[PDB]
């Protein structure tokens, strides 16, 4: 109960909520019913509209009016936006030349240059360049500031989760807002747009800015503008904000506009009825450059144009049905749309199952538009699975589609021509930023990034410290002019040992045999050089990966290759190799088809053994380093150490052996050289991050040897690649993988065809950040390079996404 009967007088859009209830006056009270009566006739007054006119200059002021074009508005802070313009012969911000921005150019007592966040809702990328005749005053933002082509939303990409993820730099799964809709079973509360449990603050996780801004003694706007607050007031009020004395004036500010998702979810995303919202959205940035010109602070306020995702062509008729898959229907809860989410309709059903219900989906029609997951197997790109309102069961929607229960569902909820909400490596969901200000780079263009990436760079604008994020600070730092993070390297934790040759072959008991006993101090001299490092520096381009973490492992050097070897999970954690653009691939010869061979350096103790792999029947093994890229006859025998073997199902190993007889060789072709390096991945409470022994769930039948969630691989080149990959003079080129370790190919539904046909695109749909496998792993890769930390920090946020030009 509000009893709303005081008033708003002199406090409009006040920047503090207020008890006793009062009433309140802020930007929430609209949400929460609770405004003082007087709040529209004081605080949204809107005659005589937003622009000063000839005849309305140098007015007596009139209380009444929405601006003022009165002598005394500048000191009052609250002039029409063209007021200068139409009263003072001053020119609109657009019409001026740009001029580079060396230092702020502030009022006095201004103690840092202000944040203003201009926030626009399904703002897709390419509007960039395909709306740019209509919107001059975005398009000289972008020419003079810094830009990206684009940037990449958060999975879903839907709008709370990305403007939360904007707000935190964290995943969704992290701070909690992983949809538009959720349940949260340990609540039993749910979720949604509509409504009031929304405004329950036990939905939103971490720390957002403005939180963050505050504990830090620094004050910011609000986030929050009530959806019937017209565009022109919400600029007036921060215009009015930042005309306070210092002690009140906020430092960070956000606008956001509902234009151009709320059109483009009528018109599609090119719809001729875009081109209105467009040229709306450029009149208001129009007047907040206007207005900032009118404050002098044109040259002192670091603006961001930012968007939160993009939008696709969807309409009704691309929805597909999960009653055309399943008996079992009416069991079930799906949030539906362009991700699917399945639960249980009901917890006292010991009938309902997961398994069956995925079968059910599974590669069920020839052009099938969703494909099923389990969200542990969903690709560790997505980040999407370590939140208890992320149920089990997931689809992955195609772009340009629906899912839906029943078709009752789609036409008793065609209106809709756009929706959004797909994998984030799909271009049409691809955003916009724009950096323009004292602290960003004057007329630049910077590499596409993740807007998990912003909450650090805001955070470094306001000098604040970041809380706890998913960025890496640091690697934007190629944005700035000034206020740069210099980021330092983990240290080392676990330093490795390098064992010689301590034992003789009979000590080992593995059940493992290789055709090898077939016999000169030339090729022996030679060997021993090899097993203590002699050819390192070809394999092993970038330094070794550090380990940040307590363990026991031992550094392997071999001709071809070099490995960590880890004691505690019985294989490598990492295995290092080149192989140039000369390279040839070779075959495993027929004696040595099923070849292991004791490694004299490691303990029996400390080793895997063959029969573990004969007594279980759905694992086998595969190797890190591939016999088929042996430099030479005698190399190829250190390709089959059993310190080399790792557990592999035998539906993986045809994904592996693929990887490594084929696409190694074709990369380096391609890239003139490459560096590969492979190894496991132990993720078993599907966290992000890297399992300890206590954590791991399988292991080969009647052993101590964990078996991988995935496998990894880390392919280095030159940039420019005129240059080989192991003798490159700068910038690297990458490209990873996190491969999950399954025992069936049912996620590739061409599977029963040959490896050609359907492995390369398995591969690119799992394609990863070195930054995810760093997490995952906890290893520190590139730490001897010739290149600057914060441009390693960028390469190793890096993906490729396959996706051809936006
Ligand atoms: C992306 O970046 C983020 C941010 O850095 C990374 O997430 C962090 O990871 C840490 C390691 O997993 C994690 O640390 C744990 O936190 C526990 C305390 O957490 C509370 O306090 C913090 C700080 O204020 C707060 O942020 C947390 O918020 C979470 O939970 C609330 C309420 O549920 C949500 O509102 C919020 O959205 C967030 O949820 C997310 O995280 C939780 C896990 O915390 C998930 O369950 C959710 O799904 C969701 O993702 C919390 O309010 C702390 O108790 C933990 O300590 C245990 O383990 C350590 C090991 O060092 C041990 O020393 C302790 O003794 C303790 O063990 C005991 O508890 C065990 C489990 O109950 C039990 O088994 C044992 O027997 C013991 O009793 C731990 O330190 C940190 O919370 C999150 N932070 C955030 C914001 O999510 C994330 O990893 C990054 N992602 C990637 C891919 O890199
Ligand atoms: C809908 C109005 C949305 C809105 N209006 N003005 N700002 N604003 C907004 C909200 C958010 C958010 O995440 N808010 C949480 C929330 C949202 N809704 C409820 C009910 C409870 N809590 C983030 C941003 C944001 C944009 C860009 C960047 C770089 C950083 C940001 F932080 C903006
Ligand atoms: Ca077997
Ligand atoms: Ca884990
Ligand atoms: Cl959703
Ligand atoms: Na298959
Ligand atoms: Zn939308």
Redesign the pocket.
């Known amino acids: 109960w509000t009893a709303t009967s005081g008033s708003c007088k002199g406090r409009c859009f006040e920047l503090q909520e207020v008890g006793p209830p009062d009433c309140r006056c802020d930007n929430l009270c609209k949400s929460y019913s609770s405004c003082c009566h007087d709040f529209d006739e004081l605080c949204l007054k809107t005659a005589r509209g937003w622009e000063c006119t000839k005849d309305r200059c140098g007015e007596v002021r009139n209380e009444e009016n929405a601006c003022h074009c009165s002598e005394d508005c500048l000191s009052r802070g609250d002039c029409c936006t063209n007021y200068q313009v139409v009263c003072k012969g001053e020119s609109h911000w657009v019409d001026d030349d740009c001029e580079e921005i060396k230092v702020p150019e502030c009022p006095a007592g201004f103690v840092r240059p202000p944040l203003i966040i201009f926030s626009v809702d399904g703002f897709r990328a390419s509007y960039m360049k395909k709306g740019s005749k209509v919107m001059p005053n975005i398009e000289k933002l972008r020419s003079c500031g810094t830009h990206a082509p684009y940037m990449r939303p958060v999975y879903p990409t839907k709008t709370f989760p990305n403007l939360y993820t904007l707000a935190?730099?964290?995943?969704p799964?992290?701070?909690?807002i992983v949809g538009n809709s959720m349940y949260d079973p340990?609540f039993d509360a749910s979720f949604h747009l509509r409504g009031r449990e929304k405004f329950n603050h036990?939905?939103?996780?971490?720390?957002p800015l403005w939180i963050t801004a505050t504990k830090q003694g620094v004050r910011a706007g609000t986030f929050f503008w009530s959806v019937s607050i017209p565009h022109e007031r919400r600029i007036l009020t921060i215009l009015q904000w930042l005309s306070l004395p210092d002690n009140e004036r906020p430092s960070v500010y956000a606008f956001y506009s509902e234009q151009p998702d709320f059109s483009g979810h009528k018109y599609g995303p090119f719809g001729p009825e875009m081109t209105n919202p467009l040229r709306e959205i450029d009149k208001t940035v129009g007047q907040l450059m206007d207005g900032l010109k009118q404050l002098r602070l044109h040259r002192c306020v670091n603006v961001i144009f930012v968007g939160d995702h993009g939008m696709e062509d969807v309409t009704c008729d691309r929805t597909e049905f999960l009653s055309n898959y399943l008996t079992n229907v009416d069991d079930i809860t799906l949030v539906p749309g362009t991700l699917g989410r399945i639960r249980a309709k009901s917890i006292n059903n010991s009938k309902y199952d997961p398994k069956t219900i995925i079968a059910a989906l599974t590669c069920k029609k020839p052009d099938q538009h969703f494909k099923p997951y389990m969200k542990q197997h969903l690709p560790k790109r997505l980040?999407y699975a370590?939140?208890?309102?992320i149920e089990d069961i997931h689809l992955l929607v195609d772009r340009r589609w629906h899912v839906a229960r029943k078709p009752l569902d789609v036409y008793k909820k065609c209106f809709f021509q756009g929706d959004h909400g797909f994998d984030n490596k799909v271009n049409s969901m691809q955003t916009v930023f724009v950096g323009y200000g004292p602290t960003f780079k004057y007329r630049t263009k910077v590499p596409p990034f993740e807007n998990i990436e912003l909450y650090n760079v805001m955070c470094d604008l306001l000098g604040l410290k970041p809380?706890?994020?998913?960025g890496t600070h640091g690697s934007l730092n190629h944005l700035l002019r000034t206020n740069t993070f210099r980021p330092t390297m983990p240290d080392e934790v676990s330093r490795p040992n390098y064992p010689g040759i301590m034992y003789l072959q009979s000590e080992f008991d593995l059940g493992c045999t290789c055709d090898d006993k077939v016999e000169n101090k030339l090729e022996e001299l030679n060997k021993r050089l090899h097993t203590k490092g002699s050819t390192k520096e070809r394999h092993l381009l970038y330094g070794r990966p550090a380990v940040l973490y307590r363990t026991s492992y031992d550094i392997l050097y071999h001709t071809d290759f070099e490995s960590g070897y880890s004691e505690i999970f019985l294989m490598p954690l990492w295995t290092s190799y080149t192989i140039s653009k000369q390279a040839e691939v070779s075959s495993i010869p027929e004696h040595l088809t099923n070849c292991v061979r004791p490694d004299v350096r490691v303990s029996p103790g400390f080793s895997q053994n063959c029969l573990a792999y004969k007594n279980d029947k759905q694992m086998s093994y595969g190797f890190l380093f591939p016999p088929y890229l042996s430099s030479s006859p005698e190399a190829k025998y250190d390709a089959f150490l059993v310190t080399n073997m790792v557990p592999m199902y035998p539906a993986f190993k045809r994904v592996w052996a693929y990887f490594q007889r084929v696409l190694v060789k074709k990369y380096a072709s391609e890239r003139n050289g490459v560096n590969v390096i492979s190894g496991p991945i132990f993720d078993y409470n599907y966290?992000?991050?890297r399992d300890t022994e206590d954590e791991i769930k399988q292991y080969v039948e009647g052993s101590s040897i964990p078996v991988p969630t995935h496998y990894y691989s880390i392919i280095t080149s030159c940039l420019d690649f005129t240059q080989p990959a192991d003798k490159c003079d700068g910038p690297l080129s990458v490209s990873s993988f996190i491969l999950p370790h399954r025992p069936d190919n049912d996620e590739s539904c061409n599977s029963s065809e040959d490896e050609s046909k359907w492995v390369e695109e398995l591969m690119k749909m799992h394609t990863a950040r070195v930054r995810?496998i760093e997490?995952?792993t906890g290893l520190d890769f590139y730490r001897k390079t010739s290149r600057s930390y914060s441009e390693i920090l960028t390469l190793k946020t890096y993906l490729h996404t396959y996706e051809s030009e936006i």
């Open positions: 935190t730099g964290l995943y799964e992290s701070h909690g340990v036990r939905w939103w996780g971490g720390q980040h370590n939140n208890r309102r809380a706890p994020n998913n966290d992000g991050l995810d997490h995952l």
